[PDB]
Design a protein around this ligand. Structure first.
Ligand code: COA
Ligand code: COA
Ligand code: COA
Ligand code: COA
Ligand code: CL
Ligand code: CL
Ligand code: CL
Ligand code: CL
Ligand code: CL
Ligand code: CL
Ligand code: CL
Ligand code: CL
Ligand code: CL
Ligand code: CL
Ligand code: RB
Ligand code: RB
Ligand code: RB
Ligand code: RB
Lengths: 390, 390, 390, 390
């Protein structure tokens, strides 16, 4: 009937081919699963199901969500499965886990997302046999994660469509990025990511290395070097590597249970899932995904846009993040207080749960009552979820 | 609420590198999605979400479930996503779509599964660079679909564990397979697969080919040549290619809606989802998955094992299929009346919905009231669902 | 000194991915080496060196010419090496082996060529590491064998340059091919290839297969179906798969020794190498290679064009073979009496020794006195050699 | 009947994945060909043929020897071809070019070798098609250059056989390496490699880099750190990365003409080829190759072992270089005065011409009369050449 979030955690967002360059996704997920359990005082033997969104699982083995649960100590009598809704996967898994408890099919869910874009392999269909000529080794990260399957161009091109449709200049996108860089670096210096980040131990041969800080956050982002970058998608476009998100590795999850079950255990939940929604749009302008999804989520919760005290909207691109702020018209000072994916990072399968962690711990830190998390999804979709504190 | 199955359809299960050797999975899903709509009198513009189970989506593009819906005519306003619970994905997706309507978040769902194991590519992580020496090109079908990620051996080895644990001789497993071949060949000659199979048109260059018959069903399976086959996993084992399922391509789905919504359209539903369950077991004996999953599903429906009039249990291996019939103790004459995965084929991500199609259409022809469909899942899991006719 | 050809042999020219689809080149060469040593009565312990031309040795191991000699029984004390002059490799090795005996550095040479275009792999430089994006798997057969390294297009395009330069219409090129097909089909039925072809035993698992007939020779080549084919290179060109050679596998070699050594052993030599030459031309019109190379060889032999009684000119393309016959002006009835590479096949590294076999055994069969063999070489070269009977 | 070396040059021997990591082999050869022509005052239009030994030509295009000649300015009228006798390719091509002029078939030859082991790709035969299972991507450098095709193990194991046959201890092999390192490091400081090295311009995007020094020569090689490496081949062996050669890139060649031709042009030849030889040995002890090859060369020159004033013997391994010096018994102080392949590097296809440059220019530097160059060849072969100054 009423589902709450008992605890939540996330790993540090590592850079592409960086600290997590050789760490499989399920190893990052296993650390987060052990974290949300310890943070709520819940043993691993009590978890009924583990739902982890993941977009690039090729080469990781049979069902990496099951591997994450077994490695984290969840017994074999429990189940685990993954799902793929691209960028909104980490947040949709929380909605899927929420329905499992609402329909009486489960009691305790560890739901979230995990992604290791560095570990994505190059593939090629070779069963038929190449009789003659050259063939391509396809990058699974680009093909299955970043390339639109209906028009053939990158997700950065869909941001160029939103830039031309909403008339967002290069200087306007760069200014939004600089605002995102400085907000994330400030939250990192003040330690506003410490409560949500669980340290990850990178198992090495010549010594272990502990990763507990987002390594993608840039220090001292200058606007002068921001405007010297060339566009990375359209030759005469406006989206660059500075005003766009990056390729990153990470994992994030939360522990789900009913409000009555949390009262039995004396747990003080981070928030209460009051509504959620997912709507589809034109794949050409997939950045506009959060616009109708946030309205559907607020309508299902009986809330107005002004009722929200804190908003976490994923910053896949600066060209797509400004239109959501302009169409919905909410106060930009309550959106991404600690920065967005332009500065922190964007692991595809885990970003849905990543911004939920940042949203939950910031609502707890400043006493916010109503929150909302939303992301844009490639192929023309968007997901949103409204959280209310208890 | 009460969720029913308005319509269901499936493509013919093709052999490995056979009729669907160059057909992507989402093209098979689009045919099944267009089928369940044209079999229930529901337009494509009414579908809210498309949930398609798939285990090997590497190289197919961004979210093949979205591509299948767009190709089938589902408008962009709707959403679509895929999920991976290995062999039970096609049936778990039906349970997930059922929960969407139960929680009031959707009205019409096209849920099922699709898999093209022939289109599965070989992958290799090459971002770090191979400084010196040879490296392996990993088969995603073997690694991500057929190899246990905890012990390293094939799923056929888990059948060898069930063989010695349940003391199932080589002659008993072959006899079960021969019975499955003769049941499937009889159902094919009598046309008991015609109502559930939607013809698929293989787009070619030198002429189109319509595929409307399961090409993996062998005619005149003899036990003499069955006992000459060598074991395909353990050198001194008992599971062979004859008493085990095969690698196949196919897709299957169903149209989900509430019982009141179906009455508003005058649709005669195939059945009513009354219960479902998923339980985990030891990965060593993953063939025992359907044993506790069917018991929890029957318990949630208020049914006994004797109340079931028709049962469809997936035959991943003859060594694993005999133990399910011995432990649950139901009458084997009502289990897989038209044959199982040993004779028809086993597309992993779609098999859960495949046996649901065979179960639904066989209940309709003989007037069965209570049914149950269940499959074993790699890594030590199992899923079951109980269907009641209207 | 005076160098003669004591004996010569060749394997049947197999089709692309045909009878020799999985046979390495050195296994084909070892059969030819064992043949020329058996057909002349020379023991393996007397061979000083083995010179085998090969263009595509990637993936076959350290020095396939050494593997061919060791497998054929030639002792380790002898030497062996391979060389690469593209299409003229099989014939240049005979000239190189001839120079070893003329300079007093050797007594008995087994020189020839071997090629397995079916075993040619796809390669990719992967030491630096592909950080992001797709990369091509380059076909070594296309890249290292059929693509000119100075202009980038196929050898069939260089035939189009000769086609436009000499004004050879589509009907004139097709008519030359039909003459070549009918000559090869007649020579195969009459058994004029039996003396030169050594049977090769294809080592298999389910039974061995003896190959002693050229499987690429097509029966009943019609001019009506010849004009139906589309151009295989230029979209509005004239060279098709019918008037051009094909991709084939095969091996050929000859036994070289001084004229005095052959008289000691009672060997009746097939012919005496009287002259040879190799000249380079423009790579765009590499088909004109045999024109100045045959003239330089005849000049070094003191022969006129009319003195030749039998000529074997390589038919890489009908557009390039007509220009050579038109420029040199020799009688077309004495040129390629038993067909050319258009009908028999064209193993690149072995074609030079293949047409030498056809010339030697046909000169012996009709009592011809003076002969000449010549080929065109990619990149703008040509090789020729004059043979005189004893 | 007397062939001299008009000029010779070589590129700096670059480390594996070092300065020449992205430089194709023929680009290094083109620099050496242009060098030997300018150093003798001979125009490119006078070269008749270019013979360049190369062992790893996969992926470089049609006949890389032809690409080196055309890029260096040699006109299209001349010919060019490559040959492969493994490690003795660079020296055998000089002997082959010598025979072209001795037999009156050519007047001016540019012969040598080129190799780019960094550019060696990974290959796999994919025409038949991998129906199921994993397959290996074979390293062409290891397979086609360093792996014995008769026993399957590395060339370092063949060095272990020579180590066990002559009873060469670990301390004895390491001492030979330190002596080679100190001789090469001293010769580089004194500038004894400046006359033979032609600077190579590495064309880059962010600035060009001039390469004129062997970057593989290690500075300050200590004997203490030499006895701290683990064996790289046998688990309980004695050959390590210190007492063995390395993987390197480089090119070297020489200008060949008759002694009368050098007089007609006023050229001061580097030396006169007086004899040459190539003998085969057991592949297990391929390091003993130079022992019987040098004896046959000295016998053909009418020289004794004491007549040699300077010797350049290739040091593929410390275990194989000590046995050759102990069996032949020549003065070690005149053998590899400036170091060997252990310190300078070992480009397979170019090492034969590399040590020939060091031999020619050191004979000129100290007034040596008689010289000899010899190498060991994998698969059980050896090549030798005797050089006398004029
Ligand atoms: C945009 C993208 C192609 C960048 O690829 P990339 O080139 O590897 O990004 P990099 O940062 O490593 O390279 C960018 C360069 O710009 C510079 N740069 C990046 N951000 C900068 C900033 N904020 N200020 C100044 N300079 C910056 C860096 O120094 C870097 O190295 P370089 O200058 O030497 O070339 C990729 O990260 C991307 O697509 N991101 C968006 C993710 C996406 O498309 N979809 C996510 C799901 S919708
Ligand atoms: C067992 C398996 C490896 C077989 O591989 P396969 O070689 O492609 O199987 P094939 O049928 O194509 O070939 C098997 C051999 O047995 C023969 N054979 C198979 N079934 C036979 C039968 N019923 N009667 C007689 N002979 C039979 C085949 O003809 C073939 O012999 P052949 O060499 O003359 O062709 C594969 O089918 C498999 O793993 N299936 C199980 C899939 C799975 O694990 N799913 C998940 C379970 S949870
Ligand atoms: C031209 C080339 C690319 C052909 O590609 P290909 O399609 O694999 O050639 P194929 O064997 O498949 O023949 C193709 C078609 O032409 C038809 N064909 C070929 N020769 C024919 C003939 N003589 N009469 C009628 N039809 C003919 C075949 O039947 C086939 O039709 P199909 O696809 O229905 O079977 C290849 O043979 C080639 O590159 N040749 C040149 C070799 C070369 O370059 N040598 C070095 C030059 S120096
Ligand atoms: C020996 C071989 C197997 C591996 O060499 P490698 O280890 O991959 O290359 P390196 O030795 O430079 O690797 C560098 C390591 O060795 C150390 N090292 C390299 N050269 C050294 C030297 N001369 N002295 C001491 N240490 C050295 C480096 O410090 C580094 O230390 P690390 O192990 O912690 O990384 C391979 O290079 C080889 O087979 N070489 C011979 C090839 C050949 O036989 N050619 C002739 C054909 S017959
Ligand atoms: Cl526990
Ligand atoms: Cl339910
Ligand atoms: Cl850190
Ligand atoms: Cl509850
Ligand atoms: Cl209802
Ligand atoms: Cl129907
Ligand atoms: Cl519609
Ligand atoms: Cl694919
Ligand atoms: Cl991998
Ligand atoms: Cl269990
Ligand atoms: Rb960024
Ligand atoms: Rb089967
Ligand atoms: Rb042909
Ligand atoms: Rb070394």
């Amino acid at each position: 009937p009423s589902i709450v979030i008992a605890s939540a955690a996330r790993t540090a967002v590592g850079s592409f081919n960086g600290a997590f360059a050789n760490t499989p996704a399920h190893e990052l997920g296993a650390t987060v699963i052990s974290a949300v359990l310890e943070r709520a005082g819940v043993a691993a033997g009590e978890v009924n199901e583990v739902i982890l969104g993941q977009v690039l699982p090729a080469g990781e083995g049979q069902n990496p969500a099951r591997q994450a649960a077994m490695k984290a100590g969840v017994p074999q009598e429990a189940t685990a499965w993954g799902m793929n809704q691209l960028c909104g996967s980490g947040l949709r898994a929380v909605a899927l886990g929420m329905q499992q408890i609402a329909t009486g099919d489960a009691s305790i869910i560890v739901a979230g997302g995990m992604e290791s874009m560095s570990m994505a392999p190059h593939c090629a269909h070779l069963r038929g046999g190449v009789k003659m000529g050259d063939f391509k080794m396809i990058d699974t990260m680009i093909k299955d994660g970043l390339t639109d399957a209906f028009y053939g161009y990158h997700m950065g091109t869909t941001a160029e469509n939103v830039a031309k449709q909403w008339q967002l200049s290069r200087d306007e996108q760069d200014a939004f990025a600089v605002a995102s860089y400085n907000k994330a670096e400030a939250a990192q210096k003040d330690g506003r990511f410490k409560d949500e980040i669980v340290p990850f131990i990178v198992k090495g041969r010549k010594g272990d290395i502990t990763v507990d800080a987002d390594e993608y956050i840039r220090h001292g982002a200058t606007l002068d070097s921001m405007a010297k970058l060339r566009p990375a998608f359209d030759k005469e476009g406006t989206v660059t590597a500075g005003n766009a998100s990056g390729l990153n590795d990470g994992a994030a999850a939360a522990l789900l249970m009913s409000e009555a079950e949390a009262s039995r255990r004396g747990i003080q939940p981070l928030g209460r899932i009051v509504s959620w929604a997912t709507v589809g749009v034109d794949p050409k302008v997939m950045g506009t995904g959060p616009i109708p999804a946030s309205r559907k989520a607020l309508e299902r919760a009986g809330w107005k846009i002004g009722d929200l005290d804190l908003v976490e909207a994923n910053e896949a691109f600066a060209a797509q993040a400004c239109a959501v702020n302009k169409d919905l018209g909410w106060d930009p000072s309550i959106v991404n207080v600690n920065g967005g994916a332009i500065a922190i990072g964007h692991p595809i399968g885990a970003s849905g749960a990543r911004i939920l962690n940042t949203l939950l711990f910031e609502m707890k830190r400043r006493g916010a009552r109503k929150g909302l998390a939303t992301l844009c999804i490639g192929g023309g979709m968007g997901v949103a979820m409204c959280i209310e504190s208890l």
